Write a protein that binds this ligand. Structure first.
Ligand code: NA
Length: 129
């Protein structure tokens, strides 16, 4: 599913991401935009052989099991395919584990490079939330 910007914001809000560990909703929407262009089916292979999955591009080296990333962990305890669902619950629940891991949203390279220190509230302006 390709979300609309406000549709995604609402979904994320309902799943407890607004201000989760102090990151306002616009941060999450901004990261999704640049990670996946709001497409839950997005996948991208990394140089190390791991793959990033879903709307928030969660990596198989640490967070999910894809059966093809040797020596990896599965810290969210989920098949990576669950992250591609139109239902974002598994991505959100896993993202809450990731953002709590020490480095905050800096875990998402696109957040650090494209969202951090920008007016992220712009991503939810105009939405009914
Ligand atoms: Na893994």
């Amino acid at each position: 599913k390709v979300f609309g910007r406000c549709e995604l914001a609402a979904a994320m809000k309902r799943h407890g991401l607004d201000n989760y560990r102090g990151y306002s909703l616009g941060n999450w929407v901004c990261a999704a935009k640049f990670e996946s262009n709001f497409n839950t089916q997005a996948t991208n292979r990394n140089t190390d052989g791991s793959t990033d999955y879903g709307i928030l591009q969660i990596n198989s080296r640490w967070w999910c099991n894809d059966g093809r990333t040797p020596g990896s962990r599965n810290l969210c305890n989920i098949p990576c395919s669950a992250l591609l669902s139109s239902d974002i619950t598994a991505s959100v629940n896993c993202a809450k584990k990731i953002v709590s891991d020490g480095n905050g949203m800096n875990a998402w390279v696109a957040w650090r490079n494209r969202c951090k220190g920008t007016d992220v509230q712009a991503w939810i302006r105009g939405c009914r939330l």
